[PDB]
Design a binder for this molecule. Structure first.
Ligand SMILES: N[C@@H](CCCC[NH3+])C(=O)N[C@@H](CCCC[NH3+])C(=O)O
Ligand code: IUM
Ligand code: IUM
Ligand code: IUM
Ligand code: IUM
Ligand code: IUM
Ligand code: IUM
Ligand code: IUM
Ligand code: IUM
Length: 517
């Protein structure tokens, strides 16, 4: 943290943040969501980290170089240490990326190594080669070298993600799946795990061995698992919570902006809200059915009438303001909603549905007041505009992600937030074989368009191919785009250090401080 001259600090430097739900895990190779990544950034530190404005910056690596965008060499700082006092070395990174790649780990982010194109990843994921064949090596204790199968100019931008953070081999091997318990865990970020009570709280405390510990100010941070956005706001205003989660309640948001405007933070955010269709299950394997659902949803009503928080109506998966995005707005987005409705009813009529034998299916969402209200509105709109019936179902966060990976569903609420600011952070998740692909979408034409983006050494061709890939996804109606997010949350006046400028929202509690009050 960089405390401004003249600022008076509180005697007690403690922070309480709401985290939306109970995390899937604290193991960097077993996580996939926002709540999980929020705690991971405080505990495990990879090669690079985001600074307070979101720029890729030095983490364990203090400097790095590349040869032809294919061989990347990272120089690790000599004083990087784990919470037990042992040095962080290049051997820790070799072990960790191999564990991520190994199919026996079954990481939801195994494909992150495919996105960065590390040598031999496809064969390792398929079981044809051992994980020790991965294109990474330690040249010495402080030098980590990565080899790619093709030139990737933006490779270093990927390295702030939790999936490529180091894990402690000795704890993993001795305790197996219990390595993350407080008595066994070892961490290398600014904080250490103090307490963990499932469905109550996660408490972290300063790690005195962290290399940049002299600049850390907050001594303790608590993360809570509150899924009701109303309850989060209530406990913030009562004084218990210093920072809410970034999901705001429809019941109170308008009033909050009038009552405490300076505490209501609303900033740009690279995420898309959509309804994920299970593309491999009838009758959702029929493009006429997917297209009807996509067109019949009224984005103006949802965005401006129901939520009214500043989100923008969506027509694509990748947000149009992503660095490198130059997307073409589909002609169906320009029509009236009436014209969209007629096209949708005609398509369902062609697919065999009638008044006596309508289309009926499930709409799954993760427990939340906001997602429930949005799903109710969508159900009503689809009933009125298209004559379809839906059954809403809620599931806890960890269970919800598992259901989507299994294909245990019909249609599901969904969000995707960028891991790095480049269109492939989104597009790579729709590749036929991606570990992040919960749409269960497989298109040879889509896969080829993305493969061609790193076969050219040019950005205009690259951006044009990304636009064509979005057109292919839209043509097939793989998903139902709803809105591009704004990042809305409440932050007390005494919490310093949060700029609102990072469009990925990669906060580190080591950068915050409590002003005397
Ligand atoms: N990109 C993921 C994490 C973003 C925080 C780290 N930058 C993300 O959006 N995860 C999703 C769940 C993934 C579902 C699989 N398709 C989320 O948190 O909703
Ligand atoms: O404040 U004693
Ligand atoms: O000194 U007093 O919260
Ligand atoms: O690396 U260039 O355009
Ligand atoms: O590698 U360039 O802007
Ligand atoms: O900031 U740019 O590619
Ligand atoms: O409808 U049903 O699974
Ligand atoms: O609090 U209510 O729906
Ligand atoms: O909490 U008083 O000064």
């Amino acid at each position: 943290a960089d405390v401004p001259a003249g600022v008076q600090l509180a005697d007690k430097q403690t922070l309480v943040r709401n985290n939306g739900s109970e995390v899937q895990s604290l193991d960097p190779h077993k996580i996939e969501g926002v709540p999980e990544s929020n705690v991971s950034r405080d505990l495990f530190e990879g090669l690079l980290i985001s600074d307070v404005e979101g720029h890729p910056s030095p983490g364990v690596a203090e400097k790095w170089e590349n040869k032809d965008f294919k061989v990347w060499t990272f120089h690790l700082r000599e004083n990087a240490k784990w919470s037990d006092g042992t040095p962080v070395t290049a051997h820790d990174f070799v072990y960790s990326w191999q564990r991520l790649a190994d199919p026996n780990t079954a990481s939801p982010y195994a494909s992150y190594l495919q996105y960065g194109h590390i040598a031999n990843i496809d064969d390792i994921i398929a079981g044809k080669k051992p994980a020790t064949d991965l294109g990474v090596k330690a040249l010495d204790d402080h030098t980590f070298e990565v080899t790619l199968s093709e030139p990737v100019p933006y490779f270093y931008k990927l390295l702030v993600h939790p999936s490529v953070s180091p894990v402690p081999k000795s704890a993993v091997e001795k305790f197996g799946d219990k390595w993350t318990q407080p008595a066994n865990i070892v961490t290398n970020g600014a904080y250490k795990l103090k307490n963990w009570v499932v469905n109550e709280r996660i408490v972290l405390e300063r790690n005195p061995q962290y290399w940049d510990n002299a600049k850390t100010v907050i001594n303790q941070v608590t993360y809570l698992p509150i899924s009701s956005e109303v309850t989060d706001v209530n406990r913030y205003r009562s004084g218990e919570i210093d920072m809410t989660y970034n999901n705001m309640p429809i019941e109170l948001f308008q009033k909050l902006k009038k009552e405490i405007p300076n505490e209501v933070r609303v900033d740009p955010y690279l995420c898309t809200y959509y309804y994920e269709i299970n593309n491999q299950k009838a009758p959702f394997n029929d493009v006429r059915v997917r297209t009807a659902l996509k067109l019949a949803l009224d984005r103006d009503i949802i965005v401006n009438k129901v939520k009214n928080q500043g989100d923008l109506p969506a027509y694509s998966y990748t947000p149009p303001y992503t660095d490198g995005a130059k997307l073409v707005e589909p002609e169906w987005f320009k029509w009236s909603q009436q014209k969209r409705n007629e096209e949708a009813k005609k398509l369902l009529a062609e697919a065999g549905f009638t008044a006596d034998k309508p289309l009926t299916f499930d709409l799954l969402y993760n427990t939340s007041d906001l997602h429930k209200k949005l799903a109710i509105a969508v159900a009503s709109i689809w009933k009125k505009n298209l004559g379809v019936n839906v059954n809403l179902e809620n599931q806890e966060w960890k269970t919800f992600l598992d259901t989507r990976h299994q294909g245990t569903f019909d249609v599901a609420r969904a969000g995707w937030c960028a891991d790095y600011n480049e269109p492939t952070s989104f597009l790579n998740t729709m590749l036929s074989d991606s570990s992040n692909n919960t749409a269960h979408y497989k298109s040879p034409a889509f896969d080829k368009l993305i493969a061609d983006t790193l076969k050219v050494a040019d950005d205009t061709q690259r951006s044009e191919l990304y636009a064509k890939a979005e057109q292919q996804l839209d043509k097939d109606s793989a998903i139902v785009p709803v809105y591009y997010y704004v990042n809305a949350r409440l932050v007390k006046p005494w919490v310093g250090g949060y700029t609102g400028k990072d469009p990925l929202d990669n906060i580190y509690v080591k950068n915050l401080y409590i002003i005397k009050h």
